[PDB]
Every structure is written in structure tokens, then in C-alpha cells.
């Protein structure tokens, strides 16, 4: 979030996050974090969940163009530079960055494509900037009506209105599949009560039942069991396995 140098909407930057204790209060507590929109999860509940992997994508886009950063949307960003899955689970966080990323008739660092041959697949990236030919005429250089140059710059000038001011965006993609969990909240772990009807929470797997020493041979790669109807029958303790 504090990376002074953010990437363009095209060729966006992605960071693989794993094996950490995640505290989201540092983020949504700050006032300048203008937008905090979460899909498939609520901001209040983030600190109480566990995730197998977390991907942090970032880029700079127009202020009025943040609407396009959402599942299943259509448009320039949603189709040719950054597309989210329709069933995307995660959070989208954006805030104004005009004071940092604007120069009068400048700010050429951030670029974006306007059209592409085919819509990008979810989380797809295209770093190439080769000249786009019309198909009816072989080409090797820019020729206006044919042989287009795909990339163009916003040219953020402080004189622009909010609709065109640069906005700094980050996307927190989550995977909610069961154990192993690489990223988890700061929830404290209590002792293991056995042979008693207790309320348990194994890496976010909440329920009520009696925990008993299992006798079914899980293979080392298995860390969570299911019975008929997909009900959880057994689980391996994350603290002692």
C-alpha cells in the first residue's frame, strides 16, 4: 500500500502473499482509504478468517474509472487491461492520489490500452505493445487508420476534475479453500478440549461437536475430511497436526 511506485493498469503488479498473520485494521481504519468494497466477505469479518493464499494487485486508474474494477463488468479496464472473475472473492480498495501522481501536461508513467483483439481472461496480463495491424495490409510501423499503437497515457494534470484525477487502487484476491491456511487473522489459539461438546473454530471452520482422537489414516497431504453431503467429519489440528 505504501509502495511509492505503483504500476500501470496494463502490466499490473502482483505480489504473492503467504505465511503471515494478517491485520486488516491498519487498512480500513485509515480515513484516506476512500473506498473499501469487499465481495464474498465483509470488511468487519476479515480479521476472523483464514485464507490459503492472498494476491495483492495494484495499479493507477481514473477516479471515475474505478467503477470498472468489479466482477463481470465491461469496459476498457474491465476488458483489455484488468478483468476480475465473475465469482471473484476479495476486496477492492481505492483512494485518490492526485497529489502524488499528477503533473500539468505530464504524468506519462501510467499507461492503458484502449482496445484489444480479444477480451483478456480473468487475471490475464499482456506486456506486449506491438503495433496492431488492420489485417488487410501487412505493416511494420504506425500508419494512422491502420497499424495502431495500443498504449496511451492518461496524462494526469492537477487541473483535471475528480472524474479524471488519478486513483490508486489495490485488489486483494482471496482463496477460501480449506487447510492448509497460509494467511490468518490475529485470533488467539486456545487449548484443545477433547471428549466434550464444545464450540470449535479450526482455521475459520466454526461448529459445535465432540472432538475425539481420530483413528482414520489421513495421508500426509490430507488435512481435512468430509462425510456424505460434504459435511466435515474430521480435521487435523493446525497446532499439532
Amino acid at each position: 500500500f505504501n509502495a511509492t511506485r505503483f504500476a500501470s493498469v496494463y502490466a499490473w503488479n502482483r505480489k504473492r502473499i503467504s505465511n503471515c498473520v494478517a491485520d486488516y485494521s491498519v487498512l480500513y481504519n485509515l480515513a484516506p482509504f476512500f473506498t473499501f468494497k469487499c465481495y464474498g466477505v465483509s470488511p468487519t469479518k476479515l480479521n476472523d478468517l483464514c485464507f490459503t493464499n492472498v494476491y495483492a494487485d495494484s495499479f493507477v486508474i481514473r477516479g471515475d474509472e474505478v467503477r470498472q474494477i468489479a466482477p463481470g463488468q465491461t469496459g476498457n479496464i474491465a476488458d483489455y487491461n484488468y478483468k476480475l472473475p465473475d465469482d471473484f472473492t476479495g476486496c477492492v480498495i481505492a483512494w485518490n492520489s492526485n497529489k502524488l501522481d499528477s503533473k500539468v501536461s505530464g504524468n506519462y508513467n501510467y499507461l492503458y490500452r484502449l482496445f484489444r483483439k480479444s477480451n483478456l481472461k480473468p487475471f490475464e496480463r499482456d506486456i506486449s505493445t506491438e503495433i496492431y495491424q488492420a489485417g488487410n495490409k501487412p505493416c511494420n510501423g504506425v500508419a494512422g487508420f491502420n497499424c495502431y499503437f495500443p498504449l496511451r497515457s492518461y496524462s494526469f494534470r492537477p487541473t483535471y476534475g475528480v472524474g479524471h484525477q488519478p486513483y490508486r487502487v489495490v485488489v486483494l484476491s482471496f482463496e477460501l479453500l480449506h487447510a492448509p491456511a497460509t494467511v490468518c487473522g490475529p485470533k488467539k489459539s486456545t487449548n484443545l478440549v477433547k471428549n466434550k461438546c464444545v464450540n470449535f473454530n479450526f482455521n475459520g471452520l466454526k461448529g459445535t461437536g465432540v472432538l475425539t482422537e481420530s483413528n482414520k489414516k489421513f495421508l500426509p497431504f490430507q488435512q481435512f475430511g468430509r462425510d456424505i453431503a460434504d459435511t466435515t467429519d474430521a480435521v487435523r489440528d493446525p497446532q499439532t497436526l
Partner: antibody
Amino acid sequence: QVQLVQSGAEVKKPGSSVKVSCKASGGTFSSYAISWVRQAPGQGLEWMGRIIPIFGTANYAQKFQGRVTITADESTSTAYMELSSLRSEDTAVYYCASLASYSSGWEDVFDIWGQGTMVTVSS
Amino acid sequence: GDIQMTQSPSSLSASVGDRVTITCRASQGISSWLAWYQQKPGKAPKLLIYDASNLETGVPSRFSGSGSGTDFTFTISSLQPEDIATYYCQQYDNLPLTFGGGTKVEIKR
């Protein structure tokens, strides 16, 4: 790889106009943009203007607006700059560098430079 | 108006192996948009530090720098004979780029 090559030293009288160039080679011209830097004898660097040939935008320093003009083309993969009505103070070296801070990550730091071109103004 | 940088000290003299530092300052707080160049007499400038605190490809670890806002510092862990040159700070917060007055460093004896 990417390289820039400048022309040889040029000389002409005060009040005339000086043309300078620097070849662009390697990579692709569509990925290039050019700047122009000065080094007169016995002091530090100085900057004149900036051009992005593929975007068509150019800018000049306030001390060089109007007097300096920047142009480039892709057929020769070269950039041309002109300065008019030279004073004796215009005796300096001309440097063009692969333009910087043009996109994601590349910074307004001049990475690749030409070999230079000395110009002197005298009667 | 145009942003003007001040480099202090203007001149230096230290023997090979000694710790030396260079500083460059701007009139108003720039958002860490600063870089450093090395220029031998009559030679093309060479990029050493591009971001306020990052090193360019192939630059020896002998060179380092840090700073934010208005004042910045450029330090060398150990001077070497090749260090007879002038180093310039380049500010790029806004397009009207300025080049520092340059700090000239020589070998002491």
C-alpha cells in the same frame, strides 16, 4: 540492446542556427523517446527539452522555449533538434539520452546516453 | 517558479578508502523524485542512483543514498581512485527539470 550515436562536432558564427542529431539503434523505435542535455566547458549539466516521438508531445525549458525545436522520425529512427540565434554562451556539448519516466517503472532518470557533440560559437 | 536545487559542499577532497558524503537539497519538499549521476571530465554522465534510495544495475555496493522531502544525502562507503569526477543530483518532481550545481571530489594526499 539499445544504443544512441551522436553526430560530430559542428561550428558556426553567432546569430546562426545549429542542427544536431543522434541516431537511435537497437530494439524498436516505437519504444524510444529522446531528451537533450547540455554540457558547456567548466560547469555542470543543463537540460533543454523533451520529446516523445510516438505520442507527439514535446516540452522545452523556459530558458530555451522558442529558440529550441525538437523533431524525430521513425524511418531514420533519429531525433533532430535545432537552436536559433546562437550567442557566444551557447558554446557547449549536446547530449541525447533514451528518454526516461515514460511508463510503468522506467524513471525520469537518463539511463542510456550518446557519445556527445561539441559546438562552439565564434566569429 | 522553477525548482532549484542546492548541492553542498561544492568541493571535496578525501583519500582513497575514506568515508565521504554528498548532499543535495530542493527549495520545496519533493516526493522523493530525485536521482544521482556521475560524470568524468568530458565523459557522458553515468546513472548510479535512480530512486531516492535505490541503485542502478551494475552499480557497486560501494555507493548508497537516502533522503526524503526537502533534503537528501549521497554517501560512498569507500573512496577509490576512479572517484575523480563530478556528481549531480537530478530532481524530477515536476517537468521543469533542474540539474544540481554538482559536487567535485578529488583524492587527498
